Design a protein around this ligand. Sequence first.
Ligand SMILES: Nc1ncnc2c1ncn2[C@@H]1O[C@H](COP(=O)(O)OP(=O)(O)OP(=O)(O)O)[C@@H](O)[C@H]1O
Length: 289
Amino acid sequence: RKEKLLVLMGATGTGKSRLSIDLAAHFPLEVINSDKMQVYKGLDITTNKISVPDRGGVPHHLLGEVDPARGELTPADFRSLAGKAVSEITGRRKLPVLVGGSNSFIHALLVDRFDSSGPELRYDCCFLWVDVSVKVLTDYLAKRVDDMLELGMFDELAEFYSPEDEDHDEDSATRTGLRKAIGVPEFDRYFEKFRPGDVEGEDPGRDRVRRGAFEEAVRAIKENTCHLAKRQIGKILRLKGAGWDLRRLDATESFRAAMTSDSGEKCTEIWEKQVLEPSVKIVSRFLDE
Ligand SMILES: Nc1ncnc2c1ncn2[C@@H]1O[C@H](COP(=O)(O)OP(=O)(O)OP(=O)(O)O)[C@@H](O)[C@H]1O
């Protein structure tokens, strides 16, 4: 008896959470987060967690409930926690929907036998892959960094900052857990020089370095995001080698339109037609046979 699982895939910021919520208006469902940074409670802004008002009352799992203090949630920990949630949701007769972009979490969860120390499918999957042209994605991702700063990302990180942390001079790649999130390592470099709340006060040529350091942290964040996007896409392209029937949704014009600070009526129209209507149809057919 192999359970049905909808899987929403795509690089960071391609509108996966959005889509999961729009589909809920058509199908009774519940969401399981598959983004490995979003599993931790904390840095709600920095990690781009979908706001609660925007979840539309949809039930979410594996979203902001792991205590970062307890270390990394390994891919094996995830398989266990999420397989439980898949099982529970189906129990309540709603469709479980895996939403996120950590291909390492998606894979650990979905395979038949997990290769614990790695470094077919356990479920009956439907894969929706939301794709955006790199350039549009890139540009949207830079804009989104600006919206995170405008929302207060910097103050969030200044409050998260702690001199008892021993990884300030280290990249996300080898950091552990929530401290790997894009934005944390970048601003640690800035706070290195300008500790939270520290001011110049009177006559320091220091201003030119403060501005240069801030600016540099911001470009680095946009850049790392852009690079992460590239590695995710290539990675997705490789599962589209291992077979995997990915149903591609082209969100490009939705995003282009979303770039305008007129990101509402126009962006919604396009998305409704180009991304949502097609997904409803695919899921609809997946729920039948
Ligand atoms: N929501 C997020 N906010 C901030 N940074 C993120 C977020 N999601 C991913 N990242 C960054 O990208 C890295 C890889 O996350 P990814 O979603 O691609 O899963 P992954 O497949 O396990 O990647 P990898 O195993 O190569 O580290 C994370 O370690 C983190 O630094």
